């Protein structure tokens, strides 16, 4: 598991969870 | 006397720039994608990318940056055209509509600069102090940012540093400071300057000038918490900030040059990088929070995340998702995951966007085989190289057919313990009705047994309460799903016939003469509710759920779109749209977040409206489909589905951005239709006409259906060979010198995993570094149905293929694949050795017939008159197919890259620079130079319209037409040809060819493909069409608003570094078809003298059906 991929920027969470 | 016409057949699909910011509102995560002349704006919503407004400018977007200065509501967009048009924009949705106000604008070209290698650079201050430009060498331009500078004013500083690579504004400085990488003798360096917009000078910059890598190509502005600049070279990534300095050199990087970068975190701790090999890295600035609460930066680390497509833009959106803007291939959407689930790739594709990529070559084929052809292009480069098969219009593929003679209705029916799959299809003839019993696909009908026999069924559905109704000319009839017998029937009061029928799951609206009766479906009973006689005679009805507040109607007298409630027949509206022929079909359905009303006149036109359902208030526009009464019907592909327009020009109305799509269907004529999800033809459609009774499926949501054939290598040329029923494609792949002194495969591409896969081994020559990238060219025998690499014939080392021909030669019965190559040694830039090879695809082998040794580069060649016209370096030979199959050879002296042949012994060659005109005579075998062109052009494409019209395109994104001069003395003045046409396209044409995408008053058809994936058509106009639309141009600039206030006059002007002329002999429907998107006051300001709206609105409607 990547170290540098924990905690990517989140401006809104309901922003990309449909697809 | 050359009057032409160019339209866009496909918007540019390549992505050149993409930025993120708050443009619509505050905290509105917008993705702004720059194509070429198009600008796309999106809002990040749960759904994914959803657009708000796709605008269109009169320029090539070269700089696109976002920012909101001191005290602003939302970010202000900034755009710079490659022709030097600057403008600041502002999204303003104050009204229910959308308008991009142009806060400022101004042209900032300098009459005295030279554009620099690495092109234009547009940088903006960290705190919105100024815009900085790097248009020309040695001239850094400054545009201060206040409010009164609405006419964008600017001034130049002077730059002692002459060759400059990349410039950036540094964060966290005492005042504007600039960091850039420039080159001179003794390598290249990084210098620092301070911009002083109070004295218009350069001041000594914050820190020392460092030496950097020789191939430093990018400078990254590092944000406030750290401050500094990151410089990305080929092999070392370095960090510069004053005296502090860090650098790591992973060998993981050198294999491909890093091209793009994107900032992830606001802190700048994480960055995204991109290779030309398609990689995606994560550059890290790891932190070291010290005792005094401060944060510092300790090291750099780069570790690979996986691979996207080759990226020219890069952008993190939200929730671990990155938009990959690809210029050489499909742009896509990407999710980065902490857990590398499969292999080592932390990258997962979510969505891909069709990019026709760099269109290198193409050709037209009748794959559908009526009159409508399909474009087969060579898109993409390197691993994203593919073939694209542009099919125009919604198509079907039939599964069966039955000789029927004149049906008058189609209806699905379900007569069993409900299996959810329709098992019965019911037809109707002018009287007789026959209930087809089809457990399989049977013909024999058993009238499932109460349905009427010879009275001509008007509706046949599956009503609720588990029953089956039939409306006919006798009565409505209810056959049950309990004993399967006739249990209820509504005869007529007067015992007379029914005219109109309208039935849903539980309601029925019928009509007799002028009367309107209402019925409700109940178990084994038919109940009467409402009752009314209309003002006039009923022509068509519609009800739409199993209970409808409204009931639409069409009357026989005044073409009145009238809406009625159903519990009674209270009139809710009538429209002032009285024609003269009857309305035939009417329908109201739900497409997307809306409710439209549709009505079909008997002449062939159709109206659409909008409304809600709590009042009957309703968007007139005379859209014309066919010429015969268009019978409407709703159909079901997925759940959110659309309506079918039965006509002799079958249209389909889909949902666009919640508006209207009108895509023709590739069928001749259809009169009646209904969907079908059958236990024998599932999710099929039943199509009726005057002949057969087809049944098949559907394809697409809009006009084009783009088929893709991934090749994973670079395709260069393409031909089509009908006798073999397969395509011919030349292609090259990349290979790197191994530890053994030979090459290797980068990735398994199509030529290496082909079925046959032969090679060469031809001794025709007799008179070698390590760690390089070499090219390997092949001839691909792609099949035309199951696109696959049947055969892949490989050429010799250092041999590049440059031209492809599929023709017959002389009186030889065979059709051959002729390939002309060029020996390229990575040293001397004009080839001295070449080859023309003639192959034949007999059965499964690729025979080598002949082989004429040639010394020179066979740039292009074309079949001429059974002879093999070829262009070798500076000679244009005319070969001839010997009976011994030897192709013996016949002269000019000129570097021909491109070569076309009208016929009639007349030729077109380009490129020492300009165009030439050569003629062959059965006289000596030699050509005569008829009339050439002398004003130079660095050209890229060529085509013939007729004997006196020659289409050109050059490296400058312009078009132009040549034509033989008719002046006084034919002694010399005829020996020249002038340029009756000049036009600026903004696209880089690579290939011209003839054909049309539509099955087909205006003469001609020539298609062209471009680097940005744009496809366009060229036509010709008589002197009465050209002068009509020309004045229709010079009156539309006044009444159409330019986004950047860029006058259309300037955009189309023939622009180079030398002659900047006005356009002539050209007309763009992209500026004239838009005339159907204005209001009538404006629309009637252009059409007043010299002619009304209804005499242009439906004339242009012919001019959109050319592509």
Residue numbers in the entry:
A (entry chain C): 1 to 19
B (entry chain A): 1 to 545, 551 to 623, 625 to 773, 780 to 901, 905 to 1015, 1023 to 1112, 1124 to 1140
The authors write:
As a structurally distinct sub-family of CRLs, the CRL4 E3 complexes consists of three well-defined basal subunits—a cullin4 (CUL4A or CUL4B) scaffold protein, a RING finger domain catalytic subunit, RBX1, and a large adaptor subunit, DDB1 (DNA damage-binding protein 1). Its two other β-propeller domains, BPA and BPC, form an interwoven double-propeller fold that is shaped like a half-open clamshell, and provide a binding surface for DCAF substrate receptors. DDA1 was first identified as a subunit of the plant DDD (DDB1–DET1–DDA1) complex, which binds COP10 and together plays a role in repressing photomorphogenesis. Its animal ortholog was also found in mammalian CRL4s and the DDD-E2 complex (DDB1–DET1–DDA1–UbE2E-E2).
In order to map the DDA1-binding site on DDB1, we crystallized and determined the structure of DDB1 in complex with DDA1-NT at a resolution of 3.1 Å. In comparison to the free DDB1 structure, DDA1-NT binding does not significantly alter the DDB1 BPA structure. The C-terminal half of DDA1-NT, meanwhile, meanders along the junction between blade 1 and 7, making both polar and hydrophobic interacts with DDB1 via Asn15, Phe16, and Phe19. The corresponding residue in human DDB1, Asn319, directly participates in DDA1 binding by donating two hydrogen bonds to the backbone carbonyls of DDA1-NT.
